[PDB]
Ligand binder design. Structure first.
Ligand SMILES: [Ca+2]
Length: 572
């Protein structure tokens, strides 16, 4: 049994100016393998493994080549991996189909929830209540809440309670972000919307006055650019809000409205907000579902994305892509339109699962990798998953995604829709004092992020040592208090950021597995196995034997004592 497919990025991909060839086998059934090519031969070694399977990799420069793999079995076997019979050798085109974005591999990412980050312009706080959803909603009407920066949390905290945060607030904090090394910024929705989060877009072409004018945003984009930063904006194509004029046209016109084809109206006439009268997102009358399968709707939304790419944004983030109708004709056209206007653009989709079909080269450049950071890395840092189970989950991740996809992965652990990682690690609830144990796990989880291929993503204020339970009215979205700091956690993230810049092996795409003893999780980093990352998730110090050679600690010989809830990075 051997699996191999050059058409799929998981087995053949171009990363770090090299051609990465990988095949799948059964666990503990291969002793050696050699990637034999046209005048050239390279040894293959296993890089990841899981429950029932392994993956061996080899690298070679980007060059047209014919090749086959010679696998030596465990029980003294010898097989040749060929295809067909009239053409046994494989053929690599040498061409680049799925390029790896270098500016995503080397950058640090910071996620900004604008209304809760920094209020740099108090004049626009009142501009939130006119078009707020609770005012327009004929069913379930309400009254939004305007409050100060340090006010207590209310049931409307997730949306319809506004604290002020605007675009001029992040502009004034660019000096703070590059102190953290931040090179990429992911901004939440900012278009005309009736919520605090902004996922009920009214006009995809107009900035919302809650966060600022177009000139304040132009000043934000330009000031971030000259500091060498890129900004990704949030795109919500699947559904809009009840204040969207195209939806209001359907509201009092019905079949008279030309925009009737854009929606799925069940009953007409209807009162705004009735989930039973039109299809919404999860049946919610607040978020009427857009007919993305319609050609008029598709080009309008693609036209809005190109407008804001043309405006200055360097990439797009797509809300709920798995709910967009006809994904085989929407995202291929979305990607084709955005890659023409800016071939250096970053396309990241919100898929919370390990799904390679979204990163095959025709839709997204990367997924919001919850399947890596939250799914398996957060659980490990909690002291609950062993090293064996953790690595076995990582083995599935890294064997299913092309190495070029992994090298530009949007590697986040929490966001605006989850509790803060310091709370997940047992640090407490908002208002409490974080236990020093949970900070030992927060440094462990952060160092795991900043050592893997891709870009590490940090939610706003996680570098400040904050708490927040999603179950208590979305405490993760409490505004940042800029007069309080956990200077230890702040300088911790600063030291990780420069470490990632000092050591080019952490930014590379090549990572190889070592072993895993109980709580110990060890893996190599770099193309020549220069760096070894050893971690320990349990409360007791473990004993580990090192790979061959002498190692320089950056974050020795023989066997070592990896500390409890500790993470060490070594080099040769
Ligand atoms: Ca404001």
């Amino acid at each position: 049994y051997v699996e191999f497919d050059p058409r799929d990025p998981a087995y053949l991909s171009i990363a770090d100016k090299r051609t990465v060839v990988r095949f799948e086998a059964k666990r503990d059934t291969v002793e050696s393998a050699v990637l034999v090519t046209d005048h050239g031969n390279y040894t293959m070694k296993l890089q990841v493994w899981w429950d029932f399977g392994e993956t061996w990799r080899a690298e070679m420069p980007v060059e047209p080549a014919d090749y086959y793999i010679l696998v030596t079995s465990s029980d003294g076997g010898k097989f040749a991996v060929l295809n067909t019979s009239e053409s046994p050798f494989f053929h690599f085109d040498g061409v680049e189909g799925f390029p790896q974005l270098e500016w995503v591999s080397n950058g640090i990412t910071y996620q900004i929830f604008p209304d809760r980050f920094n209020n740099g312009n108090k004049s626009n706080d009142a501009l939130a209540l006119d078009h707020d959803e609770l005012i327009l909603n004929q069913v379930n009407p309400g009254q939004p809440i305007l409050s100060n920066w340090s006010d207590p949390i209310t049931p409307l905290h997730c949306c319809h309670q506004y604290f002020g945060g605007d675009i001029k607030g992040i502009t004034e904090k660019l000096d703070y972000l590059q102190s953290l090394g931040v090179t990429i910024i992911y901004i939440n929705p900012i278009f005309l919307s009736g919520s605090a989060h902004g996922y009920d877009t009214y006009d995809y072409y107009r900035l919302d006055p809650k966060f600022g004018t177009e000139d304040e945003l132009r000043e934000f984009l330009d000031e971030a650019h000259r500091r060498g930063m890129r900004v990704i904006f949030d795109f919500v194509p699947n559904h809009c809000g009840i204040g969207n004029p195209a939806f209001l046209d359907v509201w009092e016109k019905g079949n008279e409205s030309p925009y009737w084809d854009w929606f799925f109206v069940k009953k007409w006439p209807f009162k705004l907000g009735d989930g039973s009268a039109y299809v919404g997102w999860w049946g919610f009358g607040s978020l009427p579902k857009l007919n993305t399968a319609n050609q008029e709707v598709r080009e309008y939304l693609i036209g809005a994305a190109l407008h804001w790419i043309e405006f200055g944004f360097d990439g797009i983030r797509v809300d709920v892509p798995n709910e967009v109708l006809d994904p085989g004709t929407f995202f291929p056209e979305l990607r084709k339109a955005v890659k023409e206007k800016k071939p250096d653009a970053y396309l990241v989709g919100e898929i919370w699962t390990l799904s390679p079909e979204w990163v095959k080269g025709d839709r997204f450049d990367s997924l919001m990798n919850y399947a890596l950071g939250r799914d398996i890395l957060l659980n490990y840092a909690k002291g609950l998953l062993s090293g064996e189970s953790a690595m076995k989950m990582m083995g599935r991740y890294y064997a299913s995604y092309g190495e070029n996809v992994v090298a530009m992965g949007f590697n986040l652990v929490d966001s605006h829709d989850t509790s803060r990682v310091l709370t997940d690690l047992g640090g407490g609830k908002l208002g409490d004092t974080p236990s020093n144990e949970s900070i030992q796990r927060l440094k462990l989880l952060s160092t795991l992020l900043y050592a893997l291929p891709g870009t590490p993503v940090t939610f706003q204020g996680d570098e400040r040592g904050l708490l927040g339970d999603k179950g208590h009215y979305d405490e993760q979205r409490y505004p940042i208090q800029w007069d309080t700091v956990n200077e230890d956690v702040l300088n911790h993230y600063r030291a990780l950021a420069e470490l990632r810049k000092r050591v080019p092996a952490l930014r590379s795409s090549a990572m190889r597995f070592y072993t895993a003893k109980g709580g110990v999780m060890a893996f190599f980093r770099g193309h020549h196995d220069e760096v070894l990352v050893v971690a320990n998730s349990w409360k007791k110090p473990a004993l580990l034997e090192l790979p061959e050679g002498e190692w320089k600690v950056i974050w020795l010989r023989g066997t070592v004592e990896v500390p409890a809830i500790g993470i060490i990075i070594l080099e040769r």
